[PDB]
Design a protein around this ligand. Structure first.
Ligand code: GNH
Lengths: 431, 431
């Protein structure tokens, strides 16, 4: 359909980057609706060589308008760095990007809090959380934060900013024993950027209503994996916001009924970064094989990604939560060379009961044992294949089995980083 | 449609109590998806006049299951009361209600933290004081708060609580200079009933999915009013949670594409309780007539009930937000006898431009001039009519001016307080 949602169906790192660049070639509007400066996108597919964490890759294409919805927490410092960075590369960012007046602002004290929490809690163990994304979401729901619209009335901004800073400084020094952030400095850093940010503000709700009825192709883009959904993922091993397709309405202002197609990116195997339940995790050279052939090193500074077989039970939960229309399968070639391949079809519970549904957070994620289905592997390479006929029989059976177990089709298959090394079986836009 | 979502399209008080009760006759499931114990639905029961603020109205219906989704902040204290009230009136609540384990819990400290927050920045003014819904969400967001699901391990629960209580006690004592909530008083109160709640729990998204395949009739019930939306409302004049249809998915776990029909209840004229922009407020004798005639003297919930003509411009926005399917014109009987009726169609901004869209929820509302469309009225009584023929000819014109102005049809018409005083022109369930 005309309005499409693209998101990861697992726990992150599924390989959505390329698909997004590919599908952004046909879109008029590209919209961010959740998370913050944690998108992660290394430009290669037409993009020089840089990682954008806030602005969408649609910012490269001259025919598209990139929109940052209200569901996105906005750090004025992160943005300006990315802009000037692109502007240095001659990309006219300020005339191709639009923002919502309701986007919460991430500010020095928000980062300051995160850095202390990562200290206060536990201990120094690769504290990769000092971003300020969660704290901006807290101030919002608690109704004491600031938004972009607030930058319209500079007088009242100072007033508001002082009241909220006083409160954060209190806990910073009297509870955390950290340093106090300086109010005047933050007011100054913000004031100097205000005229710029407001020149981009637009009524995002009304604009999309226009695109929809006019019939334009709008691509909605998710940034974190589905199972990290604050509400339905593995609590507390979840993010600070909703990551499923259900977040498109609140994070952008459009009605839930105006979601046509929902494309879910599925990697051929499993990976998790950090703590949290993971039944299919492999603690052998297979897990190793998958880690090395998949470049699953996405965790620099003494860290790593957990590896494993595809878990159709967990994926089933994603289908449910995201009302997925189709799947896009990635990293299938990582499997080339495996004598046998496995697929988790059911979880066995402690009392011997087998179930096809994910455990109620408060349950046996700890006691569940994986019911595997083992199937033949392949020796021939799949990398770069551009037609289903280039695929061996075993890989074709794997793919269809996923479909049977899951009940949803695989409408796109990516066999390599090149645009043409893609198999579009249905096309999200024109179907 | 099997999946019907019901909700007020303005600022609350749109008169939805009767509609929800009516649709409840054909619903198999009635779901609460957002807000907390401030979703008041008054109703007669056994000669006694009780009001429910948490439990869905379908609790009376014999074969209806009432479900409190994860998007709702739960207050056990406020749950036992209602329950105790109805189980006394002879109704088997424990057997007709179910609830999500992912529901954040609202405890004494939350209210403590709420109270202080108002009487503080607002001795003889405004703030947040009250229920403790927002402090309850802020915790969900920071990833500290507890969930029904925690109740399964009575010991893990104890330690979790001690920690959060320490963090919050510090705040109240040092930052606030308020009394420090007793950890054991809370512990004892939550354990006194842990096992009642853990026994009404169910996997709600898996359930609603089962229902969606067997084609059962599910109704979703909103609590507040669209324009009070935390994100898309008249900021800063808004409430705690989201109020649009966007939250049915996030708040219950149901996929976006499964929302079939969104009924937006809409009052025949406007009212607002408390401070906030209100471009159609009347300051003449008509305003007093609507107030009086509609018995709006803070009757349902109002410490100050302002009134005005219908704001088609603001109503247009409510359509975008919820992707409404149909309206339910309410209280038209309150307009009988008016020599003339008005509907607002555009706003004149203080800069002299005229606009048909909700100016940014941060511009110059108090300075906006509404362009009024004047229309002839009716001397006849519309109060009590049961068929759309015994209705005047001016009343139908009004009804049509609204339809064309919003692009959405009216499918039900409440012509009075008694259930039978209803004209279901289309019925959401068969639609
Ligand atoms: N006169 C009149 N009163 C109505 C109409 N529809 C609802 N009411 C009344 O106006 C008030 C509206 O609030 P309501 O939602 O019913 O209350 P609740 N939330 O169920 O307690 C109630 O008295 C209701 O009975 C109508 O068309 N005409």
């Amino acid at each position: 359909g005309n309005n499409v949602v693209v998101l990861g169906t697992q726990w992150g790192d599924e390989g959505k980057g390329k698909i997004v660049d590919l599908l952004t070639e046909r879109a008029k509007y590209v919209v961010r609706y959740q998370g913050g400066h944690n998108a992660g996108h290394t430009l290669v597919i037409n993009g020089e060589k840089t990682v954008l964490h806030l602005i969408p890759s649609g910012i490269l294409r001259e025919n598209v308008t990139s929109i940052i919805g209200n569901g996105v927490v906005l750090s004025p410092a992160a943005l300006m760095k990315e802009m000037k960075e692109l502007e240095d590369r001659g990309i006219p960012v300020r005339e191709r990007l639009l923002l919502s007046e309701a986007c919460p602002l991430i500010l020095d004290y928000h980062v300051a809090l995160d850095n202390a929490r990562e200290k206060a809690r536990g201990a120094k163990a690769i504290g990769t959380t000092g971003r300020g994304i969660g704290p901006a979401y807290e101030d919002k729901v608690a109704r004491r934060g600031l938004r972009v619209g607030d930058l319209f009335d500079k007088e009242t901004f100072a007033e508001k900013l002082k009241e909220v800073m006083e409160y954060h400084n209190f806990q910073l020094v009297n509870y955390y024993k950290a340093e106090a952030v300086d109010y005047q400095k933050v007011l100054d850093d913000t004031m100097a950027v205000a005229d710029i940010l407001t020149s981009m503000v637009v009524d995002v709700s009304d604009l999309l209503d226009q695109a929809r009825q006019r019939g334009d192709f709008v691509m909605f883009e998710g940034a974190q994996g589905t199972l990290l959904d604050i509400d339905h993922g593995t609590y507390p091993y979840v993010t600070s916001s909703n990551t499923t397709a259900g977040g498109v309405a609140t994070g952008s202002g459009l009605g839930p009924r105006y979601v046509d197609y929902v494309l879910g990116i599925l990697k051929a195997y499993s990976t998790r970064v950090g703590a949290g339940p993971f039944p299919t995790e492999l603690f052998d050279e297979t897990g190793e094989f998958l880690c090395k052939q998949g470049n699953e090193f996405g965790a620099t500074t003494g860290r790593r990604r957990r590896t494993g077989w595809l878990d159709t039970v967990a994926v089933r939960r994603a289908v449910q939560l995201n009302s997925l229309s189709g799947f896009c399968l990635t990293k299938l070639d990582v499997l080339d060379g495996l004598k046998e391949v496995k697929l988790c079809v059911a979880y066995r519970m402690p009392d011997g009961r087998e179930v096809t549904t994910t455990p109620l957070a408060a349950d046996d994620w700890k006691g569940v044992e994986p019911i595997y289905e083992t199937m033949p592997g392949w020796s021939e390479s799949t990398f770069g294949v551009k037609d289903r006929s280039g695929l061996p029989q075993a890989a074709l059976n794997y793919i269809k089995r996923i479909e049977e177990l899951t009940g949803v089709p695989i409408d796109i298959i990516s066999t390599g980083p090149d645009r043409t090394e893609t198999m579009i079986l249905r096309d999200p836009f024109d179907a």
